[PDB]
Amino acid sequence: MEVNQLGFIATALFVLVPSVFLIILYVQTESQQKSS
Amino acid sequence: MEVNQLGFIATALFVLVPSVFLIILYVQTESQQKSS
Amino acid sequence: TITPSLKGFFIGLLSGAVVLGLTFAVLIAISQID
Amino acid sequence: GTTGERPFSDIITSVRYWVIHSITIPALFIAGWLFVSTGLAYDVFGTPRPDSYYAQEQRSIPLVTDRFEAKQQVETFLEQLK
Amino acid sequence: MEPNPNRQPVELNRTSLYLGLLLILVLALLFSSYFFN
Amino acid sequence: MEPNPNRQPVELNRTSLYLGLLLILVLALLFSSYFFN
Amino acid sequence: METITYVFIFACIIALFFFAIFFREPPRIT
Amino acid sequence: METITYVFIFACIIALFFFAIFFREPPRIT
Amino acid sequence: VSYPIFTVRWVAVHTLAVPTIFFLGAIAAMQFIQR
Amino acid sequence: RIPLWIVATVAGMGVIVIVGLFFYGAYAGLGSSL
Amino acid sequence: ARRTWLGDILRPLNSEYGKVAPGWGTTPLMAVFMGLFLVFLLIILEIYNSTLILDGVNVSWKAL
Amino acid sequence: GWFDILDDWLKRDRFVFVGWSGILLFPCAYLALGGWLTGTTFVTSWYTHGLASSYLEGCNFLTVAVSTPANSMGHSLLLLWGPEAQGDFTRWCQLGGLWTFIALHGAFGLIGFMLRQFEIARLVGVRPYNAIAFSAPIAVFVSVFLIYPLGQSSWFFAPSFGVAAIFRFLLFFQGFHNWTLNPFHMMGVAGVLGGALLCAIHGATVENTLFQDGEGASTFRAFNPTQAEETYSMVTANRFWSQIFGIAFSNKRWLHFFMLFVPVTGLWMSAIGVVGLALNLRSYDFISQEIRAAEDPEFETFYTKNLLLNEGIRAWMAPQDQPHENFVFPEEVLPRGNAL
Amino acid sequence: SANLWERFCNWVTSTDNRLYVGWFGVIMIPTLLAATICFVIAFIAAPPVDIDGIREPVSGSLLYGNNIITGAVVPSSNAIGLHFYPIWEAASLDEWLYNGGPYQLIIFHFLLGASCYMGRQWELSYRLGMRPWICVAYSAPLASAFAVFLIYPIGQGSFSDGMPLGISGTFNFMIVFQAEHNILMHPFHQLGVAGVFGGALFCAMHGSLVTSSLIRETTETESANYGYKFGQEEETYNIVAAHGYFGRLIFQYASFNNSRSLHFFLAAWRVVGVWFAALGISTMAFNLNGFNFNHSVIDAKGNVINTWADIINRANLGMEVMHERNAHNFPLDLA
Amino acid sequence: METLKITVYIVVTFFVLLFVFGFLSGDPARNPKRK
Ligand code: CLA
Ligand code: CLA
Ligand code: CLA
Ligand SMILES: C=Cc1c(C)c2cc3nc(c4c5[nH]c(cc6nc(cc1[nH]2)C(C)=C6CC)c(C)c5C(=O)[C@@H]4C(=O)OC)[C@@H](CCC(=O)OC/C=C(\C)CCC[C@@H](C)CCC[C@@H](C)CCCC(C)C)[C@H]3C
Ligand SMILES: CCCCCCCCCCCCCCCC(=O)OC[C@H](COP(=O)(O)OC[C@@H](O)CO)OC(=O)CCCCCCCCCCCCCCC
Ligand SMILES: CCCCCCCCCCCCCCCC(=O)O[C@H](COC(=O)CCCCCCCCCCCC)CO[C@@H]1O[C@@H](CO)[C@H](O)[C@H](O)[C@@H]1O
Ligand SMILES: CCCCCCCCCCCCCCCC(=O)O[C@H](COC(=O)CCCCCCCCCCCC)CO[C@@H]1O[C@@H](CO)[C@H](O)[C@H](O)[C@@H]1O
Ligand SMILES: CCCCCCCCCCCCCCCC(=O)O[C@H](COC(=O)CCCCCCCCCCCC)CO[C@@H]1O[C@@H](CO)[C@H](O)[C@H](O)[C@@H]1O
Ligand SMILES: CC(C)=CCC/C(C)=C/CC/C(C)=C/CC/C(C)=C/CC/C(C)=C\CC/C(C)=C\CC/C(C)=C/CC1=CC(=O)C(C)=C(C)C1=O
Ligand SMILES: CC1=C(/C=C/C(C)=C/C=C\C(C)=C\C=C/C=C(C)/C=C/C=C(C)/C=C/C2=C(C)CCCC2(C)C)C(C)(C)CCC1
Ligand SMILES: CC1=C(/C=C/C(C)=C/C=C\C(C)=C\C=C/C=C(C)/C=C/C=C(C)/C=C/C2=C(C)CCCC2(C)C)C(C)(C)CCC1
Ligand SMILES: CC1=C(/C=C/C(C)=C\C=C/C(C)=C/C=C/C=C(C)/C=C\C=C(C)\C=C\C2=C(C)CCCC2(C)C)C(C)(C)CCC1
Ligand SMILES: [Fe+2]
């Protein structure tokens, strides 16, 4: 299968970068009670 | 330059995955005071 | 079946038992003198 | 900490140390020397003496070839070897 | 070095996060293909 | 559905994080090359 | 390769179904 | 390409120098 | 008081001091093995 | 009893004499190159 | 707490926490199997290493 | 009692501690020092390398080394009473042997000594941590004296237990394993080297931030062995480097700890790395380059320029270093630049 | 104000400026700022360099085909050797480029400002009022960097052979050396590898003990490290219970109770060996290479018995031969 | 390009001069208790 080369860093980073943001913002808040 | 193909997803993810961990654990703590 | 080599080992075991054995005995001995 | 085992300065500076030892120390210094002089040290540890590292004619090295019948080798080398 | 007042905390709850993730995981699932050409 | 006691919080301070990052950013900088072969 | 990328998403998502349904923030009647 | 990867690290690190020196957690004499 | 001559401490200090001089003598001896 | 320094210097010279021997010994010693 | 089906069916086995035999008790017979063990490994290691020989026992790919 | 008598005794002070450990530390460790020593003074190493390894033979301090078993033995523990030697302390002394000895007896000395670090440690109400740090060498000595050799062909290619004979161990790697260019080894120097600084600095950094708490030109006595009193202003510290290097080691538990880490860690990274060399898994490679090394006969990096040195180190030494192969390289085959 | 410089004068010597900048400062600060700037770029993007006496260009820039390890900014060519090849002496900018003039800039610069840091290493120990046998520790370091960039060059006559700024470069500068100096067999380098190894062992020792007799102040959930506050009045460790252990662990008297002495031992060991080492290079800088025992052990007939150093030397020739193939236009590597 | 040659000197001199004139004004002062 001859495909584009950035498929991984493209699709992948697309997932992990914004996702990591949300992840952060959640556990940053669920830790107001020091819980988490 | 004929190099390995995963250079990006390898080296890259190597940076952003563990790093994101530390990032999380920090702002998860610097938010105990609700600040951050 | 008692191959020169095998016999070599027993010999080794015995020497092993000898050095440990002699060693502990003298050791329990001096420890006993206190 | 509380320490109490027979002191050193005592004996290195002791009159008896020097009298038991003066005589016995060089007894070892001498003993070692003799060990070398007799030339037994050589036979003691196979260690060849300058006079006999290579046979007279040959130029090759007496190298141990097979781990199991090694004892032979050594000989057959030390053998033809002067 | 005097604290600025406007230091309000930030908010993203146990759910909003599920959507945020469902939002990405999807496009990611959608565009992936076109990101491979 | 009764809370377990052992819920201690987690810790990584303003600095430890700088090291954690200096730790990775580096190997990353080191191995990158070998990760390219 | 890229077909794992497809299957990884596909999957990671089925599990975003797990959490969002079973460890979802509950409705509080107050 | 990969040489940007080298230069990106090289750089984001110089900036980990920024923060860790100037926005570093201070020494509190108590 | 009266501390023994056969001390734990001593057995060690000896295993070394005996050979050493045995060796040192052996070596000072070699210093001449010409030919 | 016997002064401490006096044992050091005579003990020392020996190390300095014996060691000295060793350096000569490297010139005529078997390990010379002649 | 909160027992259940197995939670009761298996309560004995977990019960006797501190249950400990008195003194040194069994130990000796341990140390006897202990050293008795060593020679096993060693005897194996040594057959393997090629230091221990036996017949119809020359360690090699050949072995039918 | 019966045990505790042995315990009670061997366990309490008496200057040179001797403990439950000592039983294996002292004996193994002793023999070991001896093992190496006897060889350098009297034992030859000719029948394995055709090389002189003893004062007695004429070798000097930097020459003497306790050989390493001919490539004919391989990994056989080469036992004094084993099939090979058959308790013939002269032949057994000749087939090298002392090696496996020194190495194995030795291998315990460490195991044993670390234990002692625990024993004395659990007895004095301290954190064993020292004993842990000590893995640093066990890992090295294990990998580098047992693992690597065990991974290669024979005990032969294993370290040499020499002064120079050990330097050979270097080059030979550089030349064949091109270790110098192996990430893992790198952290190995990143830690030793990095740590040394850490040591030399904390040592001096401390000395200077010392409170004049004595009278005159002897700040070495002015220190209180008796009680708690920060001898070095931790405050005059940070406010120093914080302004001279930009950073401040604010705390002493971590400082005096981070110093534990630095080395021990790198060492491991070394022990890993070499583990690689065991199965010839080495970082010589670097395709990206070599692939383009083919064409463009005019492109040259140090890597290659260096890698070439290696290629010489082979061709010249292999024949005499690895005697059991009876290598033969005619005048021609040897790689050389125009001139010499 | 009577004069406006008055403020410049206290600022430079501002005992409270986040980052002290002494009088050395005013030279260091930029000497390195220019030095670094040239560097960072030369690496990222710089042409090859004829280095060796010929016209064989050695590439050392990431943008020219370098892995971070292969990376390196190359030296000046045997053409210049010692002459001063500053950016203006070269005609076309590209000349300086090719003939490898960045080196001198980078080297000369840091290699300079470095020392001023050494000065400003102490200038703060004066404005701060602290004993200052500190700046000296720093010497050993700077000495070497100076040795590997300034002595050895003056020694062999050309900046050509001065540890090339780059990772794989060092490896090169090295392997070569062994070959031409048998450095490894040099009594100095020994005392060098001596301390370094030591310090790296002591650095883990003294760090080990302290944390091993750390003291009380924590739970198991809490981080034991937290038990301490900056500006403590009494040290965190229990020195007595430390020496009381270590001392015991083999000899009791080969131990330190004198914290001032110990921390000192840590200083001087690494710092002294490193010096010898720094001198080692600087020693062989004028060709007083390491020892040499080739053919030094022989038997009766004269048949020669290889010393375990003859191998050292064997592997040495393998090195001698190859290094710098093409230039060497004569039998003896007299440089 | 003889231009650069001078453009630098000044930049070099200036500094060397700022160096000396800073230490010249004697630093026996500028420490604890201006002594
Ligand atoms: C004096 C100049 C100098 C510098 C800057 C370096 C730098 C380096 N060497 Mg090195 N080296 C040198 C001299 C130098 N070496 C000499 C004279 C020898 C002969 C023995 C060696 C032998 C050697 C080996 C065998 C190895 C290295 C390795 C390294 C790298 C690992 C980090 C390290 O060195 O830990 C030293 C300890 C420290 C505490 C250094 C901390 C400070 C770092 C940041 C120094 C480097 C920072 C960077 C160069 C700054 C760029 C300039 C600026 C614009 C930022 C690093 C790039 C390793 C490597 O190649 O990486 C895989 C490696 O395996 N070196
Ligand atoms: C693998 C299965 C197994 C396991 C996990 C155990 C575990 C145990 N048995 Mg046990 N036992 C077994 C099988 C087993 N047994 C068998 C088959 C028998 C014969 C029926 C016995 C008979 C027996 C008796 C009589 C006793 C025990 C006891 C014990 C307990 C003693 C505590 C202990 O282990 O410290 C011992 C820990 C060590 C010895 C660690 C030291 C080992 C290291 C130091 C070796 C050195 C490493 C070296 C580098 C390698 C050398 C090899 C080289 C030459 C190649 C322990 C729970 C004692 C007990 O209290 O029971 C509750 C006891 O009295 N056992
Ligand atoms: C240039 C800078 C540099 C630096 C800083 C290092 C640093 C290191 N190298 Mg190295 N190396 C270099 C260049 C460098 N190398 C070059 C150019 C080459 C050529 C390729 C090599 C080839 C090389 C090899 C092959 C190996 C190393 C290894 C090492 C590590 C050894 C660890 C150690 O401390 O010994 C560890 C010591 C022991 C394990 C034994 C300890 C014994 C103690 C407990 C007791 C002994 C003393 C006794 C008590 C007293 C009796 C003595 C008696 C004579 C009186 C260390 C990190 C080793 C390593 O890290 O492997 C992973 C290793 O095997 N290097
Ligand atoms: C430069 C090499 C090097 C040497 C030779 C060395 C030596 C020593 N390190 C010790 C300790 C340590 N080293 C430590 C970390 C490190 N040590 C390092 C590197 C070294 N450490 C590096 C890698 C790390 C950095 C942290 C820790 C912190 C300790 C300990 O705390 C301990 C100490 O307290 O020292 C004061 C001492 C322990 C003594 C002992 O266990 O004897 C008892 C038992 C022994 C040694 C018998 C072993 C017999 C075996 C090894 C046979 C080997 C025989 C040959 C190797 C001899 C050949 C000689 C050559 C000339 C070929 C001393 C032996
Ligand atoms: C030396 C390195 C490179 C050059 C080499 C030169 C060759 C010889 C040169 C001689 C002159 C060097 C003078 C150094 C002078 C020097 O370095 O100063 C070190 C330091 C000096 O203190 P200061 O003078 O800085 O103190 C401040 C006040 O004195 C000022 O009022 O104190 C010492 O270390 C004394 C040395 C004792 C050594 C003890 C070491 C620590 C533990 C040792 C204990 C072992 C046994 C313990 C049993 C319990
Ligand atoms: C040589 C130059 C090379 C350039 C870089 C070199 C710098 C190396 C510095 C390292 C110091 C030695 C060891 C540092 C440890 C340390 O830092 O420890 C913690 C740091 O956090 C940490 O970093 C924790 C490590 C977590 C890293 C996360 C990525 C790895 C796993 C990701 C998996 C994802 C799938 C901080 O301390 C810890 O936490 C403290 C609380 O803040 C406690 O007080 C204790 O000190 C405890 O040890
Ligand atoms: C200043 C001191 C302060 C601290 C640093 C001091 C560093 C001194 C380094 C010197 C080390 C080497 C000595 C020169 C070699 C030499 O030349 O002596 C040789 C044997 O040496 C030796 O036997 C070296 C002795 C070292 C053995 C140490 C073993 C550790 C156990 C000690 C326990 C003590 C209770 C004997 O000569 C050799 O053998 C002769 C044959 O008899 C040959 O003719 C040659 O001369 C050949 O060189
Ligand atoms: C070439 C670049 C690529 C490789 C990276 C370069 C390697 C640099 C080596 C530094 C690693 C050692 C970490 C220091 C220990 C420490 O200070 O650790 C903390 C972080 O400090 C830091 O380090 C901050 C990291 C940034 C410092 C580097 C700035 C470079 C500019 C210097 C120019 C000077 C003119 C500071 O405090 C620490 O954490 C505190 C809690 O906040 C504790 O209380 C302790 O003080 C503990 O030491
Ligand atoms: C090519 C490249 C970028 C790197 C090469 C490969 C690399 C980077 C490998 C690193 C990876 C690893 C884990 C290496 C080993 C791990 C390790 C901890 C090594 C030790 C070196 C290291 C990481 C940092 C060095 C620390 C150092 C030299 C100085 C910092 C500590 C310091 C400033 C001490 C002085 C100091 C003393 C003091 O008493 C007080 C009070 C203060 C305030 C101080 O600042
Ligand atoms: C290539 C590769 C890989 C990869 C992997 C991956 C990429 C992964 C992953 C991952 C994944 C792939 C994941 C996942 C998952 C998860 C899951 C899968 C889960 C789940 C969930 C579920 C199952 C659910 C359930 C439910 C719910 C939630 C509700 C509704 C419905 C139900 C009830 C059913 C591997 C490793 C293989 C190998 C190596 C390389
Ligand atoms: C390819 C690509 C790209 C990429 C990019 C990147 C990858 C980036 C980045 C990034 C980066 C690259 C970053 C960075 C940075 C930062 C910095 C650079 C900073 C800084 C800092 C500083 C500058 C500092 C300062 C200081 C300090 C900190 C202290 C000491 C010293 C001094 C004072 C100087 C681009 C976009 C281009 C384009 C498109 C595509
Ligand atoms: C082997 C053997 C054994 C044992 C052994 C021995 C007994 C050894 C020895 C010994 C020894 C134990 C040796 C050694 C030592 C020592 C010495 C003899 C030393 C040395 C030397 C020298 C020469 C030195 C010098 C010096 C010093 C001391 C330091 C400072 C510097 C100087 C130079 C002064 C066993 C039973 C196991 C088995 C059989 C065989
Ligand atoms: Fe300390």
Task: Characterize the structure shown.
Chain J: It is found in: Cellular thylakoid membrane. Chain J: Its main location: membrane. Chain J: Residues 21-34 are lumenal. The structure is cut from a larger assembly and holds 14 protein chains of 11 kinds. Chain C is mainly α and 34 residues long. Chain C has one helix at residues 4-32. In chain C, 85% of the residues lie in helices and 0% in strands. The N and C termini of chain C lie far apart (48 Å). Chain D is mainly α. Chain D has one domain: Single alpha-helices involved in coiled-coils or other helix-helix interfaces (Up-down Bundle). Chain D contains 4 helices and no strands. Chain D has helices spanning 8-12, 15-37, 40-44, 70-80. Chain D is elongated and about 65 Å long. Chain K is mainly alpha-helical and 64 residues long. Chain K has a single domain, classed as Single alpha-helices involved in coiled-coils or other helix-helix interfaces (Up-down Bundle), CATH 1.20.5.880. Chains L and M meet through β1, α5, α8, α9 and α10 of L and α6, α7, α8, α9 and α10 of M. Bound molecules: chlorophyll A (3 copies), pheophytin A, 1,2-dipalmitoyl-phosphatidyl-glycerole, ligand MGE (3 copies), the ligand CC(C)=CCC/C(C)=C/CC/C(C)=C/CC/C(C)=C/CC/C(C)=C\CC/C(C)=C\CC/C(C)=C/CC1=CC(=O)C(C)=C(C)C1=O, beta-carotene (3 copies) and 1 more. One beta-carotene sits between chains L (31, 33-35, 37-38) and I (16, 19-20, 23-24).
Task: Provide the descriptors you would attach to this structure in a database record.
part of a larger assembly; 14 chains; K: 64 residues; mainly alpha; N: 35 residues; rod-shaped; binds chlorophyll A; binds pheophytin A; binds 1,2-dipalmitoyl-phosphatidyl-glycerole; binds the ligand CCCCCCCCCCCCCCCC(=O)O[C@H](COC(=O)CCCCCCCCCCCC)CO[C@@H]1O[C@@H](CO)[C@H](O)[C@H](O)[C@@H]1O; Photosystem II reaction center protein L (chains E, F); photosystem ii (chains E, F)
Write a brief structural summary.
This is part of a larger assembly, with 14 protein chains of eleven kinds. Chain A has one helix at 7-27.
Distinct bound molecules = chlorophyll A, pheophytin A, 1,2-dipalmitoyl-phosphatidyl-glycerole, ligand MGE, the ligand CC(C)=CCC/C(C)=C/CC/C(C)=C/CC/C(C)=C/CC/C(C)=C\CC/C(C)=C\CC/C(C)=C/CC1=CC(=O)C(C)=C(C)C1=O, beta-carotene, fe (ii) ion
By DSSP, the count of extended strands of chain I is: 0
Reading the helices and strands of chain I in chain order gives H
Question: Which structural category do the helix and sheet elements of chain I fall into?
Answer: mainly alpha
Helical residue percent of chain I?
55-70%
Range of strand content of chain C: under 5%
Percentage of helical residues of chain C? Answer: over 70%
The interface involving the most residues is between: L-M, 131 and 134 residues
> How much β-strand is present in the residues of chain I?
under 5%
Give the strand tally of chain C.
0
Largest sheet of chain C: none
Q: What is the SS-derived class of chain C?
A: mainly alpha
Major sheet size, sense and barrel closure of chain I: none
Distance between the termini of chain I: 57 Å
Order of helices and strands of chain C: H
**What does the overall shape of chain C look like?**
rod-shaped
> What is the oligomeric state here?
part of a larger assembly
Q: If you compute it from the alpha carbons, what radius of gyration of chain C comes out, rounded to the nearest whole angstrom?
A: 15 Å
Distance between the termini of chain C: 48 Å
* Separate helix tally of chain I: 1
Morphology of chain I: rod-shaped
